[PDB]
């Protein structure tokens, strides 16, 4: 399984979604989005403390991991359905 | 201060430890009212005395049945007595209901009106039916030895012993009914079967008490 | 102060060192009640003396009669002459009457201290009885109580506690190996790595029951070992 197409696609999807939110390209627990899909500050009630310089909390890790897993599953099943 | 049924919980306000065998056991508040509590005290005393007589008779008959004396079991004694002796069952029922009706009616009207049976309307007897307390009918007939009219502390101790023995006898009668309904044998037969092998002959192995066993 | 049963532990308030052999040991608080404490002291003294007698009897019996098992010595067929195959009913009657008399006298002495010291038949024959559980007089004809009774009482209670533990050790050793204490010690000395509690445990050498003449007496081990 290691090195296969499914493993590589899933790892790339998770890494891409985690790297987008960390470098100010995807919604996070600290930055929300307006109606014009523009990043704006949020008002999180929890206020998860994080030593990360960009304020990346564990909630962001879970959200990005779930989104990346959904994207990777969809891509893998889509490629398997078209013969690729 | 006094020991209660469930340690740590305060006893109810309607149970102040004055009655015999008071442990503050009334979670449903059945005897919260004073008159209802008095009626229930007499009911518990009658139940305990009848259960004590029943338990003693069952134990004695079972003892005679276990040894070669020819005694029958308690669940067959009625049939054996009615068939062995030419005794008509409805006649015995009527006689018992007549005697019990007279005694219970006198006790009932004495509960409604204390000391009313001491007027002498029953063959001239007066002091024999005056009644000492509720559920405790002292006198020369019910207490010929006079244990209730001497040494008050001993009388209170005997009251506690009576109510505790009555409750234990009620539990014993319930156990007799459940044991006969489950095992189908006599109480001493169950005791002997348990003494023969206590680790494998109990309610957890009878196949009726625990259905998932 | 006296040495307690553990370093750093605090003795209870009721254990101030008055009684002999006090180590401030009471994890269950059973000695909180003074009356209960006195009764438990009498019970401990009785257990101590009976256990010392039992341990000494087992050891002397194994030394003098090594061919007789102490666990099965109670059987009527194992009794010495002329008590062999004797009726156990009369023996139990003798012991019951004598022990009942002496124990009722001791119990009455506990209930009312210094009230049964005098002999009920021959007047004038009394025992001093300075403390409960220590009658003296005819019970101590050698006169060893006219000295340091505290250290002697401490020695007595300590030897009794050790004998209690030792007697229970003898019972479990016999129930797990089927031999007496000296036989078990010799068997362990023959091969310590082969004969010990690691392998002897789990086996109950005591039978299910024994037929003593006419009636059967049920028997069991202290733990559920293999019969």
């Amino acid at each position: 399984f290691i090195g296969s197409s499914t493993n590589l696609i899933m790892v790339a999807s998770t890494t891409a979604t985690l790297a987008a939110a960390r470098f100010g390209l995807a919604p996070t627990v600290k930055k929300n989005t307006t109606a014009g899909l523009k990043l704006v500050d949020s008002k999180n009630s929890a206020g998860v403390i994080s030593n990360d310089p960009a304020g990346f909390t564990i909630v962001d890790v879970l959200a990005m991991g779930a989104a990346g897993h959904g994207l990777g599953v969809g891509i893998v099943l889509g490629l398997k359905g078209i013969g690729a | 201060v006094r020991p209660v049924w469930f340690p740590g919980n305060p006893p109810p306000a309607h149970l102040d430890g004055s009655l015999a065998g008071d442990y503050g056991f009334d979670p449903l508040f059945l005897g919260q009212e004073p008159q209802t509590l008095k009626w229930y005290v007499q009911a518990e005393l009658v139940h305990g005395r009848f259960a004590m007589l029943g338990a003693a008779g069952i134990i004695l008959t079972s003892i005679g049945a276990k040894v070669g004396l020819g005694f029958p079991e308690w669940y067959d004694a009625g049939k054996v007595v009615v068939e062995k002796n030419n005794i008509d069952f409805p006649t015995l029922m009527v006689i018992q209901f007549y005697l019990m009706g007279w005694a219970e009616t006198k006790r009932w009207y004495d509960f409604k009106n204390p000391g009313s049976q001491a007027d002498g309307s029953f063959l001239g007897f007066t002091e024999e039916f005056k009644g000492l307390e509720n559920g405790y009918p002292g006198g020369r007939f019910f207490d010929p030895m006079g244990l209730s009219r001497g040494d008050a502390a001993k009388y209170q101790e005997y009251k506690q012993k009576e109510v505790k023995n009555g409750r234990l006898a009620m539990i014993a009668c319930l156990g007799f009914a459940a044991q006969y309904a489950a095992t189908g044998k006599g109480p001493l037969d169950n005791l002997a079967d348990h003494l023969a092998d206590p680790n494998h002959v109990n309610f957890a192995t009878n196949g009726v008490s625990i259905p998932i066993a | 102060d006296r040495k307690l049963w553990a370093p750093g532990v605090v003795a209870p308030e009721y254990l101030k060192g008055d009684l002999a052999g006090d180590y401030g040991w009471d994890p269950l608080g059973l000695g909180a009640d003074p009356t209960a404490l006195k009764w438990y002291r009498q019970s401990e003294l009785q257990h101590a003396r009976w256990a010392m007698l039992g341990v000494a009897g087992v050891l002397v019996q194994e030394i003098v009669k090594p061919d007789v098992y102490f666990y099965e010595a109670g059987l009527p067929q194992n009794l010495p002459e002329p008590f062999t195959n004797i009726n156990m009913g009369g023996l139990l009657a003798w012991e019951f009457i004598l022990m009942h008399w002496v124990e009722v006298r001791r119990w009455q002495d506990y209930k009312n201290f210094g009230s049964v010291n005098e002999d009920p038949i021959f007047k004038g024959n009394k025992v001093p009885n300075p403390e409960m559980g220590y009658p003296g007089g005819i019970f101590d004809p050698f006169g060893f109580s006219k000295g340091n009774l505290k250290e002697l009482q401490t020695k007595e209670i300590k030897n009794g506690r050790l004998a209690m533990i030792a007697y229970m050790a003898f019972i479990l050793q016999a129930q797990a190996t089927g031999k007496g204490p000296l036989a078990a010690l010799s068997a362990h000395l023959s091969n310590p790595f082969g004969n010990n509690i690691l392998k002897n445990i789990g086996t109950c050498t005591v039978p299910h029951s024994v037929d003593v003449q006419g009636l059967t007496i049920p028997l069991t081990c202290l733990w559920p070992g293999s019969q």
Binding site: - | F29, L30, Q32, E33, T36 | -
Partner: protein, 39 residues
């Protein structure tokens, strides 16, 4: 207990108990004396 007995003494509870008793009596009479048409 007094309040509970007072609640049991209300019109719907009393009507329910009374009608259950009357219905049970009529049902038991028709059970032990099946098909009664005339006296």
């Amino acid at each position: 207990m007094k309040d509970f007995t007072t609640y049991l003494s209300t019109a719907p509870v009393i009507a329910t108990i009374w009608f259950t008793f009357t219905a049970g009596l009529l049902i038991e009479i028709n059970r032990y004396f099946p098909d009664p048409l005339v006296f």
